[PDB]
């Protein structure tokens, strides 16, 4: 019953991790989605600044990760992924965070080859008139102040819910004494209205908005605006018939309106190729929906349904009169539409409960994806017609998987093995951001092929008395892996997208052990590996081997913890290759980082927790972090350092 700080999350069932994002986390997150994944083994984060990192799963980047919020897809608008999908998520305002590793589900949309990440809120459960309140406050080094409110009220027939947050921090320092360009500020407000006419029926309306800003040590521009607008309608109908367990219907609308520039959170770099003030505004409008039936009978469960999605991207930019020194801000010009995506899919998942110790799960999905290029012109020179203006392209993509789970006779042990095949239609960033496409093509839009992934997942759960253990491995091949290559060319830096063939393997494992009634210990390991077979060399942007060691003492109302994080050097690199955000250049040094936490239950409604992160003020950087920008003093290919010693205190309220 004793409160504690979360430093790692175990895998609680085959391929699946479930955690409550409201619990304090001990390397302390910057109020974004990527940081709350740092505690799940297998995740690493490309750091841009103090917040809004870009999540990598088993070395896989971007849309290979399927990231949903309440069942819906929120997509960013920045062509450089300043505003990756997790940058809009404040996890403390959600109730549950679920990760499913590998291409092992078809229920949640197309293309999820690396895994599926689901932030969800539970519907209120009032049976009579009442209210509940959850809230938290966090105070830390470098002006870190966070504020969270989750209030609801209702009765048997319906409810109203408000969740909200305001979070901010000044620039932090690395372990060498340097101020890193990294301040950020986030806020969210979301309302939910629930109608429960009877216990077999729920209809929920949601709407919310947020905004933010972030300074980016690792970019030429900062994010001065991360506007989000969200609308959602959900309908869940239970026990419809004796076999129809559940019908689910859902629509959602998500809008992102992002501004980056070189003059609101920094000064233009005189020595750079942007000495004049310069702003770029972009937006993304996403409309999608889902309809799913769940059937149960005999020893079988069948989930069947369809989904659909449309999204639209537009941009406009500022102007600088070199003669007048007159600046015309981006909002003075009309939006120019540049891209529209569509997807429609049908999916089905069948489970056979053979006997009591054996489960077979099989899933299939057929997707129809299309995209239209609306760029009339391309942006060295301002000229350039666009060769594929108003062109469309489409494909039809089947995906599926089979998984066997066997429960042992003489132990609390589950073994599993799965084969998955996933096909992903290319990203906005894979089609529109590359300066060049494959050789001989007119552009990336016209030629880049869908990515096709075939992977074996396997592993085991041990749910013992004093020992809790789990392991999960994977071997896989990727046909037409979409890879970025970087060139200088005096123009600046310029990117080419190509398709290559890849081999991947890796795994995660971890154990929890109750030493005594007060002492517990846990460890985890994560490894990922990648080879570019077409070019006979290593895949880029693969995080090195990582281990975590934790030790906790609990005693009635309080606990104390310590944590060692140890990561090996990454000597497997592919220089000047990567994705749309980052590229490899050097082998990384290994490092160790040490942290302490504690927690105290003051009462049943208020608990306190506190941590020191990186106690020894280690100066270090991660393999995947962005190179620092020359305008901030960084040498060439020197990557953004991680924070030095950091103190924080948190008070959680539950009424
Ligand atoms: Cu941007």
Numbering used by the authors: 66 to 444, 448 to 723
Give excerpts from the publication.
Interestingly, the active site His117 in azurin renders the copper atom solvent inaccessible, reminiscent to the likely role of Met147 in OprC. The superficial similarity of the OprC binding site to that of (pseudo)azurin prompted us to generate the M147H and M325H OprC mutants in an attempt to convert OprC into a unique, blue copper transport protein. However, in the presence of added Cu(II), both mutants remain colourless, and comparison of the crystal structures with those of pseudoazurin and plastocyanin show small but most likely important differences in the geometries of the active sites.
